[PDB]
Amino acid sequence: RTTRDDLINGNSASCADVIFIYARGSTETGNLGTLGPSIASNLESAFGKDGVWIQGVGGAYRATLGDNALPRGTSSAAIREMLGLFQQANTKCPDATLIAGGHSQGAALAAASIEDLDSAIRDKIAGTVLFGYTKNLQNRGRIPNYPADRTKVFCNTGDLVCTGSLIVAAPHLAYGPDARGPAPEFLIEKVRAVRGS
């Protein structure tokens, strides 16, 4: 299932304990793309289906390849869309622990959104995973205004976008194993560090 709108569709009277907001890569389908579904099923296994809400960044985020060249690595409209989702999560489910992630253009989108977010909401994101982070070199492997201990970057050797380029090479399409294992492992660990059991 490449489309998940658990936060938008979810009942505020029965909020999940964990809300995961994910931005897909360039030209990918639905709002989860290629890696999102793998991360989602593993999160569901850990917290249960009613324990976690999976929400992809859709709407105005069209994941247009050309937008990788814009100043922030994505469009202003897309940043507005993701910011809106974090805000919706914060108002709809005040007590939920948030987690985020993004691949390729979506990783730049996640970094830009998190950087602009009001600190009170940003501080609720227990962990963020970034694959093929297009702003990896420029941001020195960090997300501005966000702690390094809550951030995990997956940048393959040979994935040119991780070294300051916008060229798409084979390693950029090889994050499958990370999405199936270490990425969700990191997210679950970070949620448990603050929520306990």
Curated annotation (Swiss-Prot):
It comes from the Eukaryota. Inhibited by n-undecyl phosphonate (C11Y4). Inhibited by paraoxon. Keywords: Disulfide bond, Glycoprotein, Hydrolase, Secreted, Serine esterase, Signal, Virulence. SUPFAM superfamilies: alpha/beta-Hydrolases. Disulfide bonds join C15-C93, C155-C162. GO terms for molecular function: cutinase activity. Optimum pH is 8. Optimum temperature is below 30 degrees Celsius. Optimum temperature is 30-40 degrees Celsius. Changing L65A: Increases activity on p-nitrophenyl butyrate. It catalyses: cutin + H2O = cutin monomers. The record marks S26, Q105 as: Transition state stabilizer. The 2 disulfide bonds play a critical role in holding the catalytic residues in juxta-position; reduction of the disulfide bridges results in the complete inactivation of the enzyme. The active site is at S104 (nucleophile), D159, H172 (proton donor/acceptor). Belongs to the cutinase family. This is Cutinase 1. The gene is CUT1.
